[PDB]
Design a protein around this ligand. Structure first.
Ligand code: SF4
Lengths: 51, 303, 49
């Protein structure tokens, strides 16, 4: 679907979609939010996949 | 030894502050395979000493800004962890409240950080002219954006109504004189209309020759002034086709302005006190507000 | 008053604020004592029902 969206035109001009530096703040996470992230399913799945 | 690889990549990033591609690293160190270089880059990114850029030429790896220091008291970590979004905001600026909210730090710590950064000439605090609530912080090297601060009309966070009034009056006088000369020329109606027309560049140069104020007025400033005059119902603008000339502002299009008389004189409704009454809704035959004992019509008939 | 109140106090033994870290207020043990009356000036006194 992404390829079809890009293919709306036969010839696609070189997009000036340079990745602006969107480096986000490594915000100090609140202990409650950190516990929520640790207890999240994605974190457990990533920890399982680490092995 | 991957530590030597990381040190060499750090040295190469020091040699090129704008960032290095994978081709440069391969040319500097050809005896190391691509997988080891990729692992080294991944470790450098994990430990936070490198940043990735996606340019039209590919991937660039740049050393994180640590040498540029304004707040060394305490930890460089919080210094860069404030300067990061300071730079991300850049020209548009960012209020102290938003800096505190994005930094997730108390007000005292961020106040100390901002003061120490201002001490070593890294950030400048300018007053938001759009909403005079707090002072936004920008990079010292970056030029302040005209929308968030400054402007040819705003002077010290104060709108100059007298300045725009003088501009409007002078532009209207110039356009009226030009239209009068075009009418008195009476050479040909097309020639009269073309001579009554005044380009934005012409009136801008005329205003610059006048020199009412010290601030430099760009062409688009005079264009906005003439647009406000159009909104006043006193002048008319037409977009003609002209490829290139003394203006060269819009591609193939030129805006010509001319002073035009109003369509109709003031209507008959406004000549009666009832049409300009602010309490017209409360009008009634028998009551406190009656046409028989009206003060507006009394003063109008007495005058 | 002998068991449940201690469990409730233990469930909320530590309370701290997000701003200015390393600051905390820690409860150790809570007592209810004997019934007294606050009539006397800053002094308690046994009182019958
Ligand atoms: S107060 Fe008199 S003049 Fe004003 S709207 Fe009423 S009748 Fe008309």
């Amino acid at each position: 679907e992404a390829a079809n969206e890009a293919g709306d035109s036969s010839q696609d001009e070189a997009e000036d979609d340079v990745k602006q530096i969107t480096v986000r703040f490594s915000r100090p996470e609140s202990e409650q939010a950190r516990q929520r992230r640790v207890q999240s399913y994605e974190f457990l799945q990533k920890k399982h996949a680490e092995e | 030894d991957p530590v030597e690889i990381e040190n060499r990549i750090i040295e190469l990033c020091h040699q090129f502050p704008h960032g290095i591609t994978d081709q440069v690293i391969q040319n500097e160190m050809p005896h190391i395979e691509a997988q080891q270089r990729a692992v080294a880059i991944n470790r450098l990114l994990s430990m936070g000493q490198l940043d990735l850029l996606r340019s039209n030429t590919g991937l660039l790896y740049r050393i994180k800004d640590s040498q540029n220091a304004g707040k060394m008291k305490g930890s460089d970590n919080q210094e860069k962890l404030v300067y990061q979004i300071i730079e991300d905001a850049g020209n548009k600026g960012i209020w102290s409240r938003d800096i505190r909210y994005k930094s997730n730090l108390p007000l005292t710590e961020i106040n100390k950080i901002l003061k120490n950064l201002e001490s070593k000439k890294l950030i400048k605090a300018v007053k938001s002219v759009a909403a005079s609530k707090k002072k936004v912080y920008m990079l010292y090297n970056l030029q302040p954006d005209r929308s968030v601060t400054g402007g040819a009309w705003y002077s010290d966070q104060d709108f100059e109504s007298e300045f725009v009034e003088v501009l409007n009056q002078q532009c209207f006088k110039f356009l009226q004189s030009k239209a009068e000369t075009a009418r008195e020329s009476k050479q040909n109606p097309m020639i009269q209309r073309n001579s009554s027309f005044a380009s934005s560049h012409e009136v801008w140069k005329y205003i610059c020759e006048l020199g009412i104020s010290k601030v430099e007025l760009s062409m688009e400033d005079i264009e906005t002034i003439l647009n406000t005059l159009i909104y006043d119902g006193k002048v008319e603008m037409t977009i003609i086709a002209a490829k290139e000339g003394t203006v060269g502002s819009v591609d193939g299009h030129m805006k010509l302005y001319r002073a035009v008389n109003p369509i109709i004189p003031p209507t008959g409704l406004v000549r009666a006190p009832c049409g300009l009454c602010p309490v017209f809704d409360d009008c009634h035959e028998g009551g406190e507000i009656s046409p028989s004992n009206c003060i507006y019509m009394t003063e109008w008939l007495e005058f | 008053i002998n068991v449940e109140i201690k469990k409730i106090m233990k469930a909320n033994e530590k309370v701290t604020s997000d701003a200015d870290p390393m600051w905390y207020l820690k409860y150790l043990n809570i007592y209810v004592g004997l019934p007294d009356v606050e009539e006397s000036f800053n002094v308690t006194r046994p009182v019958s029902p």
